[PDB]
Amino acid sequence: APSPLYSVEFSEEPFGVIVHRQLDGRVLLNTTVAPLFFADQFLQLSTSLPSQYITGLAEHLSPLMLSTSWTRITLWNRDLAPTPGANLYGSHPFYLALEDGGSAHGVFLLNSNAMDVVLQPSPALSWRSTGGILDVYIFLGPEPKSVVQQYLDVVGYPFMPPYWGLGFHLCRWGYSSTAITRQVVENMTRAHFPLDVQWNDLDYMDSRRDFTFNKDGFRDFPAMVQELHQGGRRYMMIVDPAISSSGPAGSYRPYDEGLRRGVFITNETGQPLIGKVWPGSTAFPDFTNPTALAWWEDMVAEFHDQVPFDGMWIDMNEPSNFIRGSEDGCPNNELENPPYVPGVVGGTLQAATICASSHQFLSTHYNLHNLYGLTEAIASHRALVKARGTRPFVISRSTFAGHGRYAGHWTGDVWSSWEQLASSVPEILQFNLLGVPLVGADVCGFLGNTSEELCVRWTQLGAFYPFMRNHNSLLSLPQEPYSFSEPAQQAMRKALTLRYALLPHLYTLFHQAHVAGETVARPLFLEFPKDSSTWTVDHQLLWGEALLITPVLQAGKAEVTGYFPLGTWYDLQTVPIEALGSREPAIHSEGQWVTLPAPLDTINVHLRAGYIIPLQGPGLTTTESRQQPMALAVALTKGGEARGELFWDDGESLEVLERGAYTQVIFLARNNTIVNELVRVTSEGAGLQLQKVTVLGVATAPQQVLSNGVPVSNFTYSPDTKVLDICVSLLMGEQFLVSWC
Amino acid sequence: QCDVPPNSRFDCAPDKAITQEQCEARGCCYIPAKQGQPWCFFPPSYPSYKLENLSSSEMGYTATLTRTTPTFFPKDILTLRLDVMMETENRLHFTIKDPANRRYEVPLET
Ligand SMILES: *[C@@H]1O[C@H](CO)[C@@H](O[C@@H]2O[C@H](CO)[C@@H](O[C@@H]3O[C@H](CO)[C@@H](O)[C@H](O)[C@@H]3O)[C@H](O)[C@H]2NC(C)=O)[C@H](O)[C@H]1NC(C)=O
Ligand SMILES: *[C@@H]1O[C@H](CO[C@@H]2O[C@@H](C)[C@@H](O)[C@@H](O)[C@@H]2O)[C@@H](O[C@@H]2O[C@H](CO)[C@@H](O)[C@H](O)[C@H]2NC(C)=O)[C@H](O)[C@H]1NC(C)=O
Ligand SMILES: *[C@H]1[C@H](O)[C@@H](O)[C@H](O)[C@@H](CO)[C@@H]1NCCCCCCCCn1cc(CCCCN)nn1
Ligand SMILES: *[C@@H]1O[C@H](CO)[C@@H](O[C@@H]2O[C@H](CO)[C@@H](O)[C@H](O)[C@H]2NC(C)=O)[C@H](O)[C@H]1NC(C)=O
Ligand SMILES: *[C@@H]1O[C@H](CO)[C@@H](O[C@@H]2O[C@H](CO)[C@@H](O)[C@H](O)[C@H]2NC(C)=O)[C@H](O)[C@H]1NC(C)=O
Ligand SMILES: *[C@@H]1O[C@H](CO)[C@@H](O)[C@H](O)[C@H]1NC(C)=O
Ligand SMILES: [Cl-]
Ligand SMILES: [Cl-]
Ligand SMILES: [Cl-]
Ligand SMILES: [Cl-]
Ligand SMILES: [Cl-]
Ligand SMILES: [Cl-]
Ligand SMILES: [Cl-]
Ligand SMILES: [Cl-]
Ligand SMILES: [Cl-]
Ligand SMILES: [Cl-]
């Protein structure tokens, strides 16, 4: 029946907006609960919440479900190693609120000013902003997945990454030559560890300047990167926002050209604001200035003509300042000293950043600070499209709402600790809810020294981060997979092998994010919201609808206890996976906690009954893996049914969906048959070979297995595991029928 | 007037440390917590905005909001415009703005 899902009414005095869910009459928003404040530098709007269960308001180190016990959450982008109760690198003024029975709604306050959000146990929320206007969106769901899709209809669907971006990335601060960088690739290859992307940190630079490389350790930088490409790998390197202002005039084009075109944030007298970062004295590009976007595009394209890098790692883009405000301090005005200062670390908006009253093209830094990182990610996305002519790959530290339309994220300077390993699961899930699915933490941790046991568990869990990079700080012990004992290497190689086998599935999950605003890594409550036991689960994750990951997140554990929603969950260890180098088969759950064996060499992964997963053969790169034959894993319901899909394209071209340059196939199991349904077949995906079908939950040994009506060359049935393993010679792009009886 | 359940008290001194006398001078309620919860909080009669001239549009509603008593913050905007937009079956959108001055707005594509 045609009607909105919401009804709206107003209180006259005191003023309030009241929003009901029409279907059940539930009050979702009621701003009558507290006074409306609207002063030049202080806005406050309050509401009742429908339950104690609320998620969002990144970026903070906390449980997925936020505490309503008098919690003050501060949104002010800040360079700080993740720690509880602190404003960190990004700001996302969006929450999703759960309602008794499993419906949900979302609220987005489109405001980029420093703000506090105060949660209290009535339960209620107060938005407190230091500027701008109140611009509020309410998303009625009713399903939590639909709330996220509706939010992303406003801020942007996630960008489609290149296929190679889903491979393993390896980085550290301290690879101080091309000779050392080449040895990392050699050492990974020798020990049969997949590696798609070699990174460098600031080591490559000449005197710590952007768009340079030193003529000592990195003299042959262009050749190193050309050689990586010849072997089928990609190359990434750090780019900082701040531009060295100290060099002789005419000797450093990024500063000289930036000055000519007026690209920099300026101060009260109209000159560049000068801060301190790696190069020493630096100016800060204004990425709200159209001329700065043109200058950045030129600097990136010119540097790419010297060194053909495949993407940009943009760090320090809060913007981060080693000193407070500027080398010349900050003036005494109401922007630098506002009447309400939110709960920021350091108790001032200037701490670890630039003056709030500094000038940008669109407004003052006071209003635009929380967009700085986002504006650099947009500038860099555009620069990479123009320089390379294929899909960009931007990984950004600082973020704002809508970031995921342009770039990915990593959670920053996490400690090599069991606590930070455990904390990474809620943070990766939170960024998926916020439309930044290309997210992960530094595998084995960034700060301090990892242990072998921690790096095994972190690699196991980190193989299920949508963005998987091992990165390490300058003063840390090495933590490359090849640096550990043989048994630890075997466990890390198994985790990377399983991730590579699942890349066709992970890529299809990114396709659904990009076309339909879906999540890639998702909490159990998004998939089973009507089961209230899922609401507080944040140490397990799903990939899409079907793959449940239950990691060990503590030292000395050989088991883990996880929640299994009602249904059958097949142990993925019953699916054969080919590796280049060296327990119940099914959980029948009523909706309950289950203790699983989890020795050091194991991470628990279960496949939900009713789902089909596409898999691909092994490689040390996606260049190799993408040429391999494919396999299906078919998880049957009790009733013999399953469904899945595969999205395939060339893995890097722009405008694939608009041009139709892709293959899309649906798989259906019913009545002892497996078929494909061809949604779209083109030259990209036409050659895809299917050589193996594994069927889980086959109750009795078949007497015959047919492919297109003819007995297959070979099959195995395991009566202990109920697994039917079938050898076939089929094409994803041509209609087939596999059957058994 | 000050009989507000502890969990439903909204902070009337979010800006500074306040005394009972200063709290009561703002027209707020002072009740120490028994052991966080604000000690200084708004009574239900604390001055807010009043809705005036609510009007129906094809997209939803518009109104004027008027504050008669200043807050303890400087530069209250005493006259605001409310716009309510029923954009889709799933999406409701409202803005509160200063009708006399363009204020900073986050750049956002339609
Ligand atoms: C706005 O930014 C500009 C930089 O773009 C600031 O210019 C700086 O002004 C200070 C003095 O106020 C200069 O310091 C002086 O240096 C000279 C010699 O180097 C020394 O003899 C003086 O005793 C003093 O230390 C500084 O050189 C200059 N920086 C540059 C790069 O030129 C300007 O102050 C900023 N305006 C405001 C109001 O903050
Ligand atoms: C509430 O609105 C009334 C009436 O405004 C008029 O009708 C509206 C639909 C719109 O078209 C306006 O432009 C009209 O002026 C306002 O009362 C009027 O105030 C004006 C200006 O002071 C005065 O000339 C009229 O005589 C008033 N008319 C009446 C019938 O009283 C009123 O000010 C608005 N309230 C607020 C708080 O803005
Ligand atoms: C960003 C990212 O988080 C990491 O993954 C990267 O590996 C890091 C390196 O690129 C990067 N963070 C680097 C942080 C450096 C911290 C420096 C602390 C500054 C203290 N300081 C400096 C000064 C004087 C100014 C000197 C200017 N050179 N005073 N205090
Ligand atoms: C929205 O919140 C307001 C304020 O909390 C509620 O209004 C109060 O309701 C109580 C209890 O019924 C009354 O005794 C008060 O007089 C009301 N205050 C005001 C200012 O009117 C209101 O019930 C809530 N609306 C809905 C639909 O839940
Ligand atoms: C790549 O692996 C090689 C071989 O293991 C490493 O070189 C050895 O490193 C040890 C230090 O632990 C030295 O004492 C040996 O002399 C080295 N052996 C050889 C054969 O040179 C090398 O350090 C690794 N490089 C990187 C970048 O990981
Ligand atoms: C990491 O190990 C190195 C080498 O023993 C040591 O110097 C350093 O202090 C360690 N760091 C921490 C934080 O323990
Ligand atoms: Cl809770
Ligand atoms: Cl419903
Ligand atoms: Cl302008
Ligand atoms: Cl402005
Ligand atoms: Cl429970
Ligand atoms: Cl438990
Ligand atoms: Cl064929
Ligand atoms: Cl007192
Ligand atoms: Cl006061
Ligand atoms: Cl005033």
Side-chain angles (χ1 to χ4, degrees):
Chain A
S3 190
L5 291 189
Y6 47 86
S7 81
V8 177
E9 45 191 291
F10 310 92
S11 170
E12 181 171 9
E13 192 171 21
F15 164 71
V17 181
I18 303 104
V19 180
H20 292 269
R21 181 176 300 287
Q22 284 207 344
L23 182 57
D24 59 15
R26 196 176 295 286
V27 179
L28 305 182
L29 196 79
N30 182 0
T31 73
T32 321
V33 297
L36 171 64
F37 280 59
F38 202 118
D40 193 43
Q41 289 182 263
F42 187 78
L43 314 185
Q44 187 176 277
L45 184 74
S46 305
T47 180
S48 63
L49 288 173
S51 82
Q52 295 299 332
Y53 297 89
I54 177 171
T55 190
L57 303 178
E59 184 166 23
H60 298 88
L61 198 59
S62 67
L64 187 54
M65 291 293 162
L66 303 175
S67 170
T68 61
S69 308
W70 303 104
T71 302
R72 181 179 63 185
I73 304 176
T74 302
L75 277 61
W76 181 249
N77 292 358
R78 166 62 188 258
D79 181 355
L80 186 73
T83 192
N87 50 305
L88 309 174
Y89 310 107
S91 289
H92 298 249
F94 168 81
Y95 69 84
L96 186 155
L98 287 173
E99 300 161 33
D100 180 45
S103 280
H105 75 278
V107 180
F108 176 42
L109 175 60
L110 174 59
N111 181 294
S112 63
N113 284 96
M115 75 169 74
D116 282 332
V117 183
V118 176
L119 305 189
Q120 61 192 78
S122 49
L125 177 148
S126 302
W127 304 97
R128 292 182 192 151
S129 186
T130 55
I133 65 156
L134 299 171
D135 187 346
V136 178
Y137 292 89
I138 308 102
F139 308 107
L140 268 294
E143 304 88 0
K145 285 187 293 181
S146 298
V147 170
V148 169
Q149 175 265 312
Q150 291 159 5
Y151 169 56
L152 300 186
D153 279 339
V154 171
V155 299
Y157 289 179
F159 86 103
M160 187 68 184
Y163 194 99
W164 61 252
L166 302 187
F168 189 51
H169 302 259
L170 188 54
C171 196
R172 87 167 286 169
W173 188 356
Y175 299 144
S176 53
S177 69
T178 59
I180 290 167
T181 306
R182 283 182 186 100
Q183 282 184 19
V184 175
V185 179
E186 168 181 3
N187 286 0
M188 287 286 283
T189 300
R190 182 192 329 178
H192 303 272
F193 291 110
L195 172 65
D196 260 77
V197 197
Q198 181 64 45
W199 294 42
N200 288 287
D201 210 320
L202 51 76
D203 304 276
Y204 74 83
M205 288 180 186
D206 186 69
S207 307
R208 286 141 20 257
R209 292 177 301 169
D210 279 345
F211 307 116
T212 70
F213 63 88
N214 67 71
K215 303 309 194 273
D216 302 342
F218 281 81
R219 176 179 294 271
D220 62 331
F221 195 24
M224 181 187 82
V225 176
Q226 290 159 4
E227 288 162 19
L228 282 167
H229 289 165
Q230 288 165 5
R233 289 187 179 80
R234 271 79 176 191
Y235 182 75
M236 287 285 284
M237 82 292 165
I238 196 166
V239 179
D240 285 339
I243 305 294
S244 179
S245 60
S246 66
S251 74
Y252 181 57
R253 173 166 169 79
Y255 188 67
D256 302 332
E257 184 72 352
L259 210 60
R260 184 178 76 75
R261 299 192 72 181
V263 308
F264 295 119
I265 297 184
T266 55
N267 71 12
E268 178 175 43
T269 47
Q271 292 101 44
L273 184 148
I274 305 301
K276 290 283 187 184
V277 214
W278 279 122
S281 296
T282 57
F284 297 84
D286 172 13
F287 297 107
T288 74
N289 182 342
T291 306
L293 299 187
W295 161 86
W296 190 247
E297 293 164 7
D298 289 346
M299 297 307 97
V300 167
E302 289 169 20
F303 195 53
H304 185 273
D305 292 336
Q306 298 193 261
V307 184
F309 53 86
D310 295 298
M312 291 167 67
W313 170 28
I314 57 177
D315 193 15
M316 302 303 271
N317 60 342
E318 293 73 26
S320 189
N321 196 357
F322 291 168
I323 57 73
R324 179 172 171 170
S326 88
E327 287 188 346
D328 304 289
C330 300
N332 176 209
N333 62 47
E334 293 161 311
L335 300 185
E336 306 292 352
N337 304 117
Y340 181 77
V341 186
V344 301
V345 173
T348 171
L349 297 184
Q350 302 162 350
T353 193
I354 64 174
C355 300
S357 64
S358 64
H359 172 88
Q360 302 191 235
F361 182 82
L362 289 183
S363 194
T364 56
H365 193 68
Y366 183 92
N367 293 317
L368 294 161
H369 169 91
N370 280 347
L371 306 186
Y372 192 89
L374 172 68
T375 59
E376 186 193 19
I378 294 170
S380 304
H381 181 288
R382 287 178 192 182
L384 287 164
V385 165
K386 290 178 165 174
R388 298 178 69 251
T390 63
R391 273 171 223 186
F393 196 72
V394 179
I395 299 298
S396 182
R397 198 165 67 176
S398 178
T399 64
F400 190 78
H403 187 85
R405 185 181 188 197
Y406 302 101
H409 177 60
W410 97 107
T411 57
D413 294 354
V414 299
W415 287 91
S416 297
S417 74
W418 293 94
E419 194 167 61
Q420 287 276 356
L421 169 60
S423 284
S424 74
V425 185
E427 193 159 28
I428 270 50
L429 291 176
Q430 181 68 272
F431 273 101
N432 272 258
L433 298 189
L434 290 172
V436 190
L438 184 69
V439 60
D442 290 337
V443 175
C444 303
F446 179 72
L447 294 178
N449 297 316
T450 194
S451 66
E452 190 161 288
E453 187 186 5
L454 176 60
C455 196
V456 170
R457 297 307 198 184
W458 211 323
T459 306
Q460 283 170 346
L461 166 69
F464 289 93
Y465 292 155
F467 171 63
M468 185 193 186
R469 177 180 72 145
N470 178 322
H471 175 52
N472 195 16
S473 79
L474 181 63
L475 300 165
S476 300
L477 290 175
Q479 63 186 43
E480 308 89 3
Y482 59 74
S483 74
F484 293 102
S485 79
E486 190 54 44
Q489 287 192 48
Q490 290 171 8
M492 292 168 185
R493 190 181 300 114
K494 177 167 185 189
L496 285 169
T497 298
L498 177 54
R499 180 193 182 79
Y500 273 70
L502 286 167
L503 283 183
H505 181 55
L506 180 59
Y507 194 71
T508 304
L509 293 180
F510 272 97
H511 167 73
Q512 292 302 314
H514 175 62
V515 303
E518 291 283 350
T519 56
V520 172
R522 82 182 52 156
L524 273 63
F525 82 83
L526 238 67
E527 200 48 40
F528 307 89
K530 297 176 168 181
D531 182 349
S532 68
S533 293
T534 68
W535 286 14
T536 67
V537 177
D538 61 2
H539 289 131
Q540 287 167 279
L541 71 149
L542 294 162
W543 272 15
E545 299 177 31
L547 281 175
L548 179 55
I549 303 107
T550 309
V552 169
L553 302 172
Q554 305 170 260
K557 296 295 186 189
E559 54 177 38
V560 64
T561 300
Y563 191 76
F564 289 78
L566 163 79
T568 300
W569 297 87
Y570 297 104
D571 195 323
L572 198 68
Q573 291 208 313
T574 67
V575 178
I577 271 83
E578 338 172 16
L580 293 171
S582 90
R583 182 163 288 276
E584 293 189 339
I587 294 166
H588 299 99
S589 179
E590 301 303 319
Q592 66 198 90
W593 294 87
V594 182
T595 299
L596 304 161
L600 187 51
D601 69 3
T602 294
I603 181 161
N604 279 272
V605 181
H606 289 80
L607 174 58
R608 187 172 170 192
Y611 292 85
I612 303 171
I613 303 308
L615 307 163
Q616 189 163 39
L620 292 189
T621 73
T622 58
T623 303
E624 179 182 12
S625 71
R626 283 175 60 85
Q627 296 179 59
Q628 298 313 310
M630 296 191 147
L632 296 177
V634 180
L636 294 179
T637 66
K638 187 175 177 182
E641 294 219 4
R643 182 190 179 287
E645 52 198 328
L646 175 65
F647 174 81
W648 191 269
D649 63 11
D650 73 6
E652 54 181 1
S653 292
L654 295 171
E655 292 177 337
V656 164
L657 301 185
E658 188 170 31
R659 295 184 293 113
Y662 65 93
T663 293
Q664 181 160 59
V665 177
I666 293 169
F667 309 105
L668 298 171
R670 165 168 291 171
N671 201 12
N672 292 21
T673 76
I674 303 164
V675 296
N676 57 338
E677 284 196 340
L678 307 182
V679 182
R680 183 171 182 82
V681 178
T682 63
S683 62
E684 295 295 345
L688 281 179
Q689 299 169 57
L690 171 64
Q691 316 278 59
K692 197 178 188 65
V693 176
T694 305
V695 189
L696 313 174
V698 178
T700 63
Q703 274 180 351
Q704 72 173 4
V705 181
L706 304 179
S707 171
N708 288 341
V710 176
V712 297
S713 65
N714 57 308
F715 73 88
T716 68
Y717 179 79
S718 164
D720 289 353
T721 62
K722 280 38 177 169
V723 176
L724 179 61
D725 204 30
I726 316 171
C727 298
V728 294
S729 293
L730 299 167
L731 295 176
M732 289 298 195
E734 299 205 359
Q735 279 195 71
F736 64 69
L737 176 71
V738 173
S739 59
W740 62 98
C741 61
Chain B
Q1 62 187 251
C2 285
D3 197 43
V4 176
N7 289 339
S8 305
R9 290 169 193 179
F10 292 85
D11 192 2
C12 178
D15 50 322
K16 62 187 263 209
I18 201 163
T19 66
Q20 174 162 11
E21 186 168 8
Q22 285 174 328
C23 179
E24 287 172 351
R26 284 178 172 193
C28 290
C29 298
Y30 182 89
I31 304 182
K34 292 204 171 151
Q35 64 172 8
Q37 164 194 320
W39 290 35
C40 185
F41 62 93
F42 298 116
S45 66
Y46 188 85
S48 186
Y49 287 78
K50 174 179 190 188
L51 181 79
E52 305 200 70
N53 292 344
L54 179 70
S55 182
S56 190
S57 47
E58 63 178 298
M59 272 298 290
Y61 308 96
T62 69
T64 296
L65 307 183
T66 303
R67 173 175 281 286
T68 48
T69 308
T71 73
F72 49 81
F73 287 104
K75 299 178 170 158
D76 287 310
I77 302 164
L78 298 184
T79 299
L80 303 175
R81 184 185 164 140
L82 170 67
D83 292 282
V84 181
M85 281 73 62
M86 299 179 178
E87 295 193 343
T88 79
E89 73 169 351
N90 306 313
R91 181 171 77 238
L92 174 65
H93 178 206
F94 72 86
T95 61
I96 304 178
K97 289 179 188 183
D98 179 358
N101 301 107
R102 201 186 194 300
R103 290 176 59 79
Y104 165 74
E105 294 190 46
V106 180
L108 178 85
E109 176 175 342
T110 67

